[PDB]
């Protein structure tokens, strides 16, 4: 309805911020979460022992 009435900015758009994290917790720099194999200082990134 919102797009049909020519005002598409009133859309309810939700970023999938709980699956944004997993792709950045697997090493995607593209979102800038900077955790867990995308954080190069991480214990999981370095496998510390």
């Amino acid at each position: 309805v919102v797009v049909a009435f020519g005002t598409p900015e009133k859309q309810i758009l939700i970023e999938p911020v709980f699956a944004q994290f997993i792709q950045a917790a697997h090493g995607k720099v593209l979102y800038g979460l900077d955790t867990l194999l995308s954080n190069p200082d991480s214990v999981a990134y370095t496998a510390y022992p």
Binding site: F21, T35, L36, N39, D41
Partner: peptide
């Protein structure tokens, strides 16, 4: 009765829910 064995494992799983959110909120790194 106070359900020890039920709440014992629910608080274990909820502690896993809170641990992963600490990585997502940068509390633990």
């Amino acid at each position: 009765p106070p359900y020890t064995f039920r709440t014992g494992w629910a608080l274990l799983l909820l502690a896993v829910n809170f641990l992963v959110a600490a990585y997502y909120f940068h509390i633990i790194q």
